[PDB]
């Protein structure tokens, strides 16, 4: 509870600082740039992705293989920051779809699959291409 109170102060102040162009932490800055890019990605390409997530027919029994097939094809011929943004947006859209269909159990599974793919298959590229700090400079 003491730790939760600390996190609440940190979240509140990080938000208030960012509202005025200041940054609580590098992690706060990466999170913010990722939220902004995800919003801008969905703003520009919403119509192009209409129905495409619905068309995957998400079920608890098929979600994992559908997730892997998508991400393996997305990064099949390499990585760039825009495809990483597309990857996060895809995961968020898949989560919203799960709750909409009353498959809330998928949210925590999807979050784990994303972290696993990020840790094992995107981090090597990220380390080679400037780290998340370079993402913030190009997208923040």
């Amino acid at each position: 509870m003491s730790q939760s109170n600390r996190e609440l102060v940190v979240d509140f102040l990080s938000y208030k600082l960012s509202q005025k162009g200041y940054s609580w932490s590098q992690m706060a800055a990466v999170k913010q740039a990722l939220r902004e890019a995800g919003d801008e990605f969905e703003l520009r390409y919403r119509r192009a992705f209409s129905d495409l997530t619905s068309q995957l027919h998400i079920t608890p029994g098929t979600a994992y293989q559908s997730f892997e097939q998508v991400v393996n094809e997305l990064f099949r011929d390499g990585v760039n920051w825009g495809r990483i943004v597309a990857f996060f947006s895809f995961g968020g859209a898949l989560c919203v779809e799960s709750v909409d269909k009353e498959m809330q159990v998928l949210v925590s599974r999807i979050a784990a699959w994303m972290a696993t793919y990020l840790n094992d298959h995107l981090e090597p590229w990220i380390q080679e291409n400037g780290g998340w700090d370079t993402f913030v400079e190009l997208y923040g």
Partner: peptide
């Protein structure tokens, strides 16, 4: 024409267009 591949190839294209801007 598999739904997974269709969304993934749109993610890739759009991703690459986004990357370029």
């Amino acid at each position: 024409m598999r739904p997974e591949i269709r969304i993934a190839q749109e993610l890739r294209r759009x991703g690459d267009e986004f990357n370029a801007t």
